[PDB]
Design a protein around this ligand. Structure first.
Ligand SMILES: N=C(C(=O)O)[C@H](CC(=O)CO)C(=O)O
Ligand code: SF4
Length: 303
């Protein structure tokens, strides 16, 4: 195998230098396969807090790596590509959050994990796709400010029955803009398939699905649903994860959908990261101290 040189040296250096490799579900298959743990933002956050190792190689995008750092301030966290980010976040600013806080004083500010760490410093609680509904339901308010993802916010409003004020204008994930016709086509081709789509998908897509869930929730659905075929409306990296967990089922992409940022991490730059022990994720202590409050509050609202 042509890659065995990179794969083998990654596994070698990881062990030799005391790293644990955490990968998000949207990383390329080759990186999922060398990771110690693969999961969604919530799971990688949880895992981060309980690992004994002092060095983490994080494979995902920056806001997530920073979440890991904020929860583990005394561990060294590195990433292979320091530009891997989520473009949705960067429309949401401090001045937007402040404006809406003033406008709606008694609305808690719920920020999605893909938000700048600076933004998290101004949140009342953080959430991921997996726990957004649970977090907002358990809050003591019928109104929340929510950002940056509009679709997710609207889905939360639907599930909880609360008023969700989304910020900024049109915050959305380009990856999850499937058109509902793809579901129409796939129902005809596989009449017994179950269609699972992400809550970041637009509402007409959500409404034609059998299930709506985050990647963490998608992965649990075949534990309770015996269907032979699932059609998956998220980023393409999740197909590899699902096929590995459930080799006796068939997983069909709703459409091909690739997150360019998530794909910035490669075997080659992952190897460079382990050789140089770069690039370190660094936040000001002030940011860490401030941002951890809404993150810990998330965990209090789950259990
Ligand atoms: N980290 C996620 C989450 O659940 O919060 C992603 C979705 C996301 O938008 C981040 O790329 C997912 O696992 O379903
Ligand atoms: S898949 Fe969408 S929400 Fe997740 S990092 Fe890429 S652009 Fe951001």
């Amino acid at each position: 195998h042509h890659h065995h040189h990179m794969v083998d040296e990654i596994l070698k250096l990881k062990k030799e230098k005391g790293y644990i490799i955490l990968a998000h579900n949207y990383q390329i298959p080759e990186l999922q396969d060398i990771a110690d743990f693969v999961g969604d933002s919530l799971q990688l956050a949880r895992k981060a807090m309980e690992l004994s190792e002092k060095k983490i190689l994080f494979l995902g995008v920056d806001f997530m790596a920073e979440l890991v750092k904020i929860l583990n301030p005394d561990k060294k966290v590195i990433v292979p590509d320091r530009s891997a980010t989520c473009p949705m976040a960067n429309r949401l600013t401090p001045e937007i959050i402040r404006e809406y806080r003033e406008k709606f004083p008694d609305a808690p500010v719920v920020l999605f994990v893909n938000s700048t760490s600076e933004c998290k410093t101004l949140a009342d609680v953080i959430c991921t796709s997996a726990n957004a509904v649970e977090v907002v339901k358990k809050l003591d308010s019928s109104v929340v400010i929510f950002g940056p993802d509009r679709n997710l916010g609207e889905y939360v409003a639907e599930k909880t029955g609360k008023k969700v004020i989304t910020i900024p204008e049109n915050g959305h994930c380009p990856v999850h803009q499937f058109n509902a016709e793809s579901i129409d086509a796939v129902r005809k081709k596989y009449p017994d398939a179950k269609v699972i789509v992400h809550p970041e998908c637009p509402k007409p897509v959500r409404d034609k699905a059998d299930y709506v869930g985050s990647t963490g929730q998608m992965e649990k659905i075949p534990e309770r649903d015996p269907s032979r075929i699932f059609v998956i409306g998220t980023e393409i990296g999740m197909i590899h994860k699902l096929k590995k967990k459930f080799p006796d089922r068939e997983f069909v992409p709703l459409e091909m959908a690739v997150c360019v940022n998530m794909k910035k991490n490669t075997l080659e730059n992952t190897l460079h990261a382990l050789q140089t022990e770069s690039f370190e994720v660094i936040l000001p202590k002030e940011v860490i101290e401030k941002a951890k409050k809404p993150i810990l509050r998330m965990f209090e609202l789950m259990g």
